[PDB]
Short mmCIF file of C-alpha atoms (C1' of nucleotides) and ligand atoms in Angstrom, two decimals:
data_model
loop_
_atom_site.label_atom_id
_atom_site.label_comp_id
_atom_site.label_asym_id
_atom_site.label_seq_id
_atom_site.Cartn_x
_atom_site.Cartn_y
_atom_site.Cartn_z
CA UNK A 1 172.24 96.05 115.28
CA UNK A 2 170.73 93.55 112.82
CA UNK A 3 169.11 93.60 109.37
CA UNK A 4 165.44 92.66 109.27
CA UNK A 5 165.38 89.11 107.88
CA UNK A 6 168.27 88.04 110.12
CA UNK A 7 166.62 89.50 113.22
CA UNK A 8 163.42 87.59 112.39
CA UNK A 9 165.11 84.29 111.56
CA UNK A 10 167.37 84.30 114.64
CA UNK A 11 164.56 85.40 116.95
CA UNK A 12 162.35 82.72 115.43
CA UNK A 13 164.94 80.07 116.29
CA UNK A 14 165.33 81.45 119.83
CA UNK A 15 161.55 81.67 120.41
CA UNK A 16 160.19 78.67 118.48
CA UNK A 17 156.95 77.33 119.96
CA UNK A 18 156.09 73.66 119.39
CA UNK A 19 152.39 74.15 118.90
CA UNK A 20 150.25 71.06 118.12
CA UNK A 21 149.02 72.32 114.72
CA UNK A 22 152.51 73.11 113.40
CA UNK A 23 154.38 71.22 110.68
CA UNK A 24 151.26 69.37 109.54
CA UNK A 25 150.59 68.37 105.96
CA UNK A 26 146.79 68.08 106.23
CA UNK A 27 145.29 71.37 104.95
CA UNK A 28 142.03 70.71 106.80
CA UNK A 29 143.71 70.35 110.21
CA UNK A 30 145.67 73.53 109.50
CA UNK A 31 142.50 75.38 108.44
CA UNK A 32 140.73 74.41 111.67
CA UNK A 33 143.61 75.77 113.74
CA UNK A 34 143.80 79.01 111.71
CA UNK A 35 140.06 79.70 111.95
CA UNK A 36 140.16 78.93 115.67
CA UNK A 37 143.10 81.35 116.08
CA UNK A 38 141.24 84.35 114.58
CA UNK A 39 141.16 86.92 117.41
CA UNK A 40 141.76 84.08 119.89
CA UNK A 41 144.86 83.25 121.96
CA UNK A 42 146.99 80.17 121.22
CA UNK A 43 146.38 78.80 124.75
CA UNK A 44 142.61 78.79 124.22
CA UNK A 45 142.92 77.19 120.79
CA UNK A 46 145.07 74.45 122.37
CA UNK A 47 142.08 73.52 124.54
CA UNK A 48 139.76 73.08 121.50
CA UNK A 49 141.77 72.06 118.44
CA UNK A 50 142.63 68.44 119.37
CA UNK A 51 139.08 67.81 120.59
CA UNK A 52 137.54 69.31 117.43
CA UNK A 53 139.87 67.28 115.20
CA UNK A 54 138.87 64.12 117.08
CA UNK A 55 135.17 64.67 116.54
CA UNK A 56 135.44 66.02 112.96
CA UNK A 57 138.66 64.50 111.55
CA UNK A 58 138.02 65.43 107.88
CA UNK A 59 136.26 67.91 105.62
CA UNK A 60 133.70 65.18 104.87
CA UNK A 61 133.14 64.47 108.57
CA UNK A 62 132.62 68.15 109.38
CA UNK A 63 130.25 68.45 106.41
CA UNK A 64 128.20 65.45 107.57
CA UNK A 65 127.98 66.61 111.19
CA UNK A 66 124.96 68.39 112.59
CA UNK A 67 125.33 72.14 112.95
CA UNK A 68 124.29 71.79 116.61
CA UNK A 69 127.23 69.47 117.28
CA UNK A 70 129.66 71.89 115.63
CA UNK A 71 128.27 74.82 117.64
CA UNK A 72 128.46 72.77 120.86
CA UNK A 73 132.15 72.06 120.16
CA UNK A 74 132.81 75.76 119.55
CA UNK A 75 131.22 77.19 122.68
CA UNK A 76 133.77 79.20 124.63
CA UNK A 77 135.95 80.19 121.66
CA UNK A 78 133.81 83.26 120.88
CA UNK A 79 132.96 84.84 117.53
CA UNK A 80 130.64 81.93 116.85
CA UNK A 81 129.96 82.85 113.21
CA UNK A 82 133.36 81.18 112.66
CA UNK A 83 131.86 77.78 113.48
CA UNK A 84 129.12 78.16 110.87
CA UNK A 85 131.50 79.45 108.21
CA UNK A 86 134.03 76.68 108.85
CA UNK A 87 131.28 74.07 108.61
CA UNK A 88 129.91 75.67 105.43
CA UNK A 89 133.38 75.57 103.89
CA UNK A 90 133.52 71.84 104.66
CA UNK A 91 130.05 71.33 103.13
CA UNK A 92 131.03 73.21 99.97
CA UNK A 93 134.29 71.27 99.60
CA UNK A 94 132.58 67.94 100.35
CA UNK A 95 129.90 68.49 97.71
CA UNK A 96 132.00 70.29 95.09
CA UNK A 97 135.69 69.45 95.64
CA UNK A 98 135.62 65.73 96.44
CA UNK A 99 136.16 66.41 100.14
CA UNK A 100 139.39 68.41 99.81
CA UNK A 101 140.37 72.03 100.27
CA UNK A 102 141.73 74.00 97.31
CA UNK A 103 145.45 74.76 97.01
CA UNK A 104 145.48 78.30 95.62
CA UNK A 105 145.15 81.44 97.70
CA UNK A 106 142.35 82.84 95.54
CA UNK A 107 140.24 79.67 95.74
CA UNK A 108 140.67 79.53 99.51
CA UNK A 109 139.57 83.17 99.86
CA UNK A 110 136.34 82.27 98.06
CA UNK A 111 135.33 80.01 100.91
CA UNK A 112 133.33 81.22 103.94
CA UNK A 113 135.41 82.27 106.92
CA UNK A 114 138.66 82.34 104.92
CA UNK A 115 139.97 85.86 104.39
CA UNK A 116 143.41 86.93 103.18
CA UNK A 117 145.22 85.89 106.36
CA UNK A 118 143.66 82.45 106.72
CA UNK A 119 144.20 81.80 103.00
CA UNK A 120 147.86 82.79 103.16
CA UNK A 121 148.19 80.81 106.39
CA UNK A 122 146.84 77.61 104.85
CA UNK A 123 149.08 78.06 101.80
CA UNK A 124 152.17 78.74 103.93
CA UNK A 125 151.56 76.28 106.75
CA UNK A 126 149.92 73.35 104.91
CA UNK A 127 151.60 73.72 101.51
CA UNK A 128 154.81 75.71 102.29
CA UNK A 129 153.82 78.19 99.59
CA UNK A 130 154.65 81.91 99.82
CA UNK A 131 152.20 84.75 100.22
CA UNK A 132 151.25 87.76 102.31
CA UNK A 133 150.26 86.59 105.82
CA UNK A 134 149.43 89.69 107.87
CA UNK A 135 147.75 89.14 111.27
CA UNK A 136 148.35 90.77 114.64
CA UNK A 137 151.78 89.22 115.33
CA UNK A 138 153.22 89.85 111.85
CA UNK A 139 151.80 93.39 111.96
CA UNK A 140 153.54 93.92 115.30
CA UNK A 141 156.92 92.74 113.95
CA UNK A 142 156.80 94.96 110.85
CA UNK A 143 155.62 97.99 112.83
CA UNK A 144 158.32 97.49 115.44
CA UNK A 145 161.20 96.73 113.05
CA UNK A 146 160.50 98.81 109.92
CA UNK A 147 158.18 101.59 111.16
CA UNK A 148 159.75 102.24 114.55
CA UNK A 149 159.08 106.01 114.70
CA UNK A 150 155.65 106.08 113.01
CA UNK A 151 152.56 107.09 114.97
CA UNK A 152 150.01 105.39 112.69
CA UNK A 153 150.67 102.98 109.82
CA UNK A 154 148.07 101.33 107.61
CA UNK A 155 148.18 97.72 106.44
CA UNK A 156 148.39 99.18 102.94
CA UNK A 157 151.89 100.42 103.77
CA UNK A 158 152.91 97.12 105.37
CA UNK A 159 151.62 94.85 102.59
CA UNK A 160 154.46 95.35 100.03
CA UNK A 161 157.10 94.79 102.72
CA UNK A 162 155.46 91.59 103.93
CA UNK A 163 155.25 90.47 100.30
CA UNK A 164 158.85 91.41 99.52
CA UNK A 165 160.35 89.68 102.57
CA UNK A 166 158.54 86.36 102.32
CA UNK A 167 161.05 83.73 101.13
CA UNK A 168 160.03 81.75 98.08
CA UNK A 169 160.86 78.27 99.45
CA UNK A 170 160.56 78.73 103.19
CA UNK A 171 157.21 80.38 103.92
CA UNK A 172 156.06 78.01 106.68
CA UNK A 173 159.19 78.43 108.82
CA UNK A 174 159.31 82.17 108.06
CA UNK A 175 155.82 82.87 109.26
CA UNK A 176 156.28 80.69 112.35
CA UNK A 177 159.26 82.94 113.15
CA UNK A 178 157.18 86.09 112.62
CA UNK A 179 154.36 84.68 114.77
CA UNK A 180 156.75 83.75 117.57
CA UNK A 181 158.75 86.99 117.48
CA UNK A 182 155.58 89.08 117.34
CA UNK A 183 154.09 87.38 120.38
CA UNK A 184 157.37 87.95 122.20
CA UNK A 185 157.40 91.66 121.30
CA UNK A 186 153.83 92.00 122.52
CA UNK A 187 155.08 90.76 125.91
CA UNK A 188 158.32 92.77 126.30
CA UNK A 189 157.59 96.17 124.71
CA UNK A 190 154.55 98.40 124.36
CA UNK A 191 152.29 96.50 121.95
CA UNK A 192 153.56 97.74 118.55
CA UNK A 193 150.10 97.19 117.02
CA UNK A 194 148.87 100.22 118.97
CA UNK A 195 150.59 102.20 116.20
CA UNK A 196 148.49 100.51 113.53
CA UNK A 197 146.05 102.82 111.79
CA UNK A 198 143.39 100.12 112.41
CA UNK A 199 143.91 99.76 116.17
CA UNK A 200 140.48 99.79 117.82
CA UNK A 201 138.64 98.40 120.84
CA UNK A 202 135.24 96.79 121.21
CA UNK A 203 132.26 98.19 123.06
CA UNK A 204 131.62 97.08 126.63
CA UNK A 205 130.70 93.39 126.61
CA UNK A 206 128.48 93.59 129.71
CA UNK A 207 124.93 94.34 128.62
CA UNK A 208 125.93 94.24 124.96
CA UNK A 209 123.99 92.93 121.99
CA UNK A 210 126.66 90.31 121.30
CA UNK A 211 126.51 89.04 124.88
CA UNK A 212 122.81 88.41 124.29
CA UNK A 213 123.51 86.85 120.89
CA UNK A 214 125.79 84.24 122.46
CA UNK A 215 123.39 83.52 125.33
CA UNK A 216 120.44 83.02 123.00
CA UNK A 217 122.35 80.49 120.94
CA UNK A 218 123.38 78.57 124.06
CA UNK A 219 119.80 78.55 125.33
CA UNK A 220 118.50 77.07 122.08
CA UNK A 221 121.34 74.55 121.88
CA UNK A 222 120.50 73.42 125.42
CA UNK A 223 116.75 73.08 124.70
CA UNK A 224 115.78 71.88 121.21
CA UNK A 225 112.17 72.85 120.55
CA UNK A 226 112.14 75.75 123.02
CA UNK A 227 109.17 78.01 122.38
CA UNK A 228 109.75 81.57 121.26
CA UNK A 229 108.23 83.07 124.42
CA UNK A 230 110.08 80.59 126.66
CA UNK A 231 113.33 81.67 125.01
CA UNK A 232 112.58 85.28 125.95
CA UNK A 233 111.77 84.24 129.52
CA UNK A 234 115.06 82.36 129.82
CA UNK A 235 117.08 85.24 128.38
CA UNK A 236 115.46 87.63 130.85
CA UNK A 237 116.20 85.21 133.69
CA UNK A 238 119.86 85.09 132.67
CA UNK A 239 120.04 88.89 132.45
CA UNK A 240 118.44 89.43 135.85
CA UNK A 241 120.56 86.70 137.45
CA UNK A 242 123.57 88.61 136.08
CA UNK A 243 122.19 91.83 137.59
CA UNK A 244 120.87 93.38 134.36
CA UNK A 245 117.27 94.31 133.58
CA UNK A 246 114.81 92.59 131.27
CA UNK A 247 115.43 92.69 127.53
CA UNK A 248 113.04 94.91 125.65
CA UNK A 249 110.77 93.21 123.13
CA UNK A 250 112.22 94.98 120.08
CA UNK A 251 115.78 93.97 121.02
CA UNK A 252 114.85 90.35 121.71
CA UNK A 253 112.96 89.95 118.43
CA UNK A 254 115.66 91.72 116.39
CA UNK A 255 118.51 89.62 117.80
CA UNK A 256 116.56 86.39 117.31
CA UNK A 257 115.73 87.36 113.73
CA UNK A 258 119.45 87.97 113.14
CA UNK A 259 120.46 84.61 114.61
CA UNK A 260 117.94 82.73 112.49
CA UNK A 261 119.03 84.62 109.38
CA UNK A 262 122.67 83.78 110.10
CA UNK A 263 121.89 80.09 110.52
CA UNK A 264 122.43 79.45 114.24
CA UNK A 265 119.03 77.84 114.61
CA UNK A 266 115.75 77.56 112.74
CA UNK A 267 112.11 78.32 113.48
CA UNK A 268 109.62 75.46 113.31
CA UNK A 269 106.21 76.95 114.04
CA UNK A 270 106.90 79.04 117.10
CA UNK A 271 109.70 76.76 118.43
CA UNK A 272 113.44 76.95 117.80
CA UNK A 273 115.87 74.14 116.91
CA UNK A 274 119.63 74.27 116.50
"C1'" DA B 1 136.01 101.89 105.34
"C1'" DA B 2 134.24 101.33 109.80
"C1'" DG B 3 132.32 98.81 112.61
"C1'" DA B 4 129.71 94.40 113.99
"C1'" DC B 5 131.09 90.27 116.06
"C1'" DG B 6 132.90 86.50 122.07
"C1'" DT B 7 135.30 85.87 125.80
"C1'" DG B 8 139.09 83.96 128.26
"C1'" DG B 9 144.38 84.28 128.98
"C1'" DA B 10 148.15 87.38 130.57
"C1'" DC B 11 149.55 90.77 133.40
"C1'" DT C 1 142.53 92.36 138.63
"C1'" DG C 2 140.28 95.47 135.59
"C1'" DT C 3 142.49 96.49 131.38
"C1'" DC C 4 144.22 94.87 127.21
"C1'" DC C 5 143.62 92.16 123.38
"C1'" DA C 6 144.05 87.49 120.69
"C1'" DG C 7 140.45 88.25 111.43
"C1'" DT C 8 136.23 88.25 108.47
"C1'" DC C 9 132.86 90.66 106.07
"C1'" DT C 10 130.18 94.29 104.04
CL1 CL D 1 126.17 96.79 122.10
MG1 MG D 2 136.04 84.27 102.11
MG1 MG D 3 135.86 93.24 127.96
NA1 NA D 4 126.98 65.45 114.29
NA1 NA D 5 153.69 94.63 126.47
#
DNA sequence: AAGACGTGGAC
DNA sequence: TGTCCAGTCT
């Protein structure tokens, strides 16, 4: 058999993936890839990252862009709050940080859309600085290798082992190896993350509130100035064309109130504008 | 904490 | 080929 760090390093060399956002120095380009990767497959991110970088090449450029343009670029990646939080982070850094991202984990975690994993990822991948980077692939490796016989294991139990095994001067290459080995394990054995205490599944997407959330934002993006009642008519048309029934008035008004509060579009009179 | 929050790639 | 599943925030 093989000790843990040697299994990871050798597997990482065997499995290395030459992804476009790897081995970059620009923390902003790395941040965009990491936000895009949250709960989203590498192959999808590959279809968006280069295009997004071309349209918004810097923190300052993303800050200056219209929110509608950023949302348009995001459509299809899902979990669209990420687009707003990423743009907000750019706006904060443009106005307060001279157009640059911070270079400590704590300061990165203070920014919208950047939790512990994205913060550690930016520090490791952009700055080659060590930290605890625990996402689905790393979780899978540690569950498979160090918790082989355990039915359910919390991230609390994994955290000290991820911390202890991160090399001081090689974090970027180490976490690429964990990412690549984890994705491999997810293909060749029963997904080890099923033994995570936090393993869950979402509600049915068809007919769901979040399906309507995403449609409503697309309808407003497509039609600046759309009236509030017209928006309801168009949502109902989409639902019926998809085979579902009309949306009840309470649900329509509640979802729209949520989307305005979150910043996807604004109300001007009775009309909506992204 | 648990649970809200998209949707397309792999099999 | 319908099912599984690829972090942040409160
Ligand atoms: Cl729902
Ligand atoms: Mg944050
Ligand atoms: Mg589904
Ligand atoms: Na713009
Ligand atoms: Na598998």
